[PDB]
Amino acid sequence: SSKYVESPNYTKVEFGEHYARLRPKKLKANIEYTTPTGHIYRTDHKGRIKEVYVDNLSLKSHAQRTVGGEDRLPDDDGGALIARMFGGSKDIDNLVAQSKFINRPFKEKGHWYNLEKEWQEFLNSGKEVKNIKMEVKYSGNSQRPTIFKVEYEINGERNIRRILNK
Ligand SMILES: [Mg+2]
C-alpha cells in the first residue's frame, strides 16, 4: 500500500511551529506536520523533506530562488512537491531544489509537470487521486534530492513513478 501509517520515528508538530529557524528558513528534524489542506510531511534527521502523504487530492520569491542551498544547481528551480493548485505551500515546507527539466514543460521531458498534468486530467474527469505517497531520496548531506518516488491510486488502481532529479 501507499496509505499514511503513523510512525514513532517522527514527532508531530502544530502547523506553524515546524520551522527550526526563520532566518534563514529551515525545517525541524525528524518531525511530521499537517498543512491546513491536509497534506502530511515528514522530515529526516537533517530537516530535509523525506515523505509526503495526500489522502485525497483535490483542486484548490526568495524560497523558490534559494531552496537547496549550496547544493542547488544552475538549472534547478524551487520546485513544489505538491503544486499550488492542489493546495500546496509556496514556502520551504513544500519546496525542494528540482531540475527545471522535470519541473517545467519540456518536450520529451518535464516529468514532474507531466505527473501534475495527469493528476489534473484525472480530477477534472471526475476520477479520484488517492493515497499519494512521495518519497524524496537524498545523497550524503546534500539538500538536493537525487530521485523522487511517487505512489498513488486512481480509482483504486495503484501507480508507481520513479523520477530522477535531472
Ligand atoms: Mg512545479
Residue numbers in the entry: 444 to 503, 509 to 614
According to the publication:
Here we report the structures of EsaG, the nuclease domain of EsaD and their complex, which together reveal an inhibition mechanism that relies on significant conformational change of the toxin. The major contribution of this study is the discovery of an inhibitory mechanism in the toxin-antitoxin module that is based on a significant structural deformation of the toxin, where the central β-sheet of the nuclease domain of EsaD is split by EsaG into two fragments.
Due to cytotoxicity, the EsaD proteins used for crystallization were over-expressed in E. coli in an inactive state by mutating the catalytic H528 residue to Alanine (H528A). The crystal structures were determined at resolutions of 2.30 Å for the nuclease domain of EsaD (residues 440–614) and 2.60 Å for the EsaG-EsaD (residues 450–614, hereafter referred as EsaDc) complex, respectively. The nuclease domain of EsaD presents a typical fold of ββα-metal nucleases (also known as His-Me finger nucleases), even though they share low sequence similarity (<20%). The ββα-metal finger (Residues 501–573), playing a critical role in nicking DNA, creates a compact catalytic center that is composed of two antiparallel β-strands (β4 and β5) connected by a long loop and linked to a C-terminal α-helix (αB). As observed in some other His-Me finger nucleases, αB is interrupted by a protruding ‘finger loop’ of unknown function. In addition, a long N-terminal loop (Residues 455–468) wraps around the central β-sheet from the β1 side and extends to the “back” face. Notice that the EsaG binding surface of the CFL part of the free EsaDc is exposed to the solvent, while that of the NFL part is buried and stabilized by the ββα-metal finger motif. There are two tryptophan residues in EsaDc (W560 and W567), both of which are buried in the free EsaDc structure, but exposed to solvent on the structure of the complex.
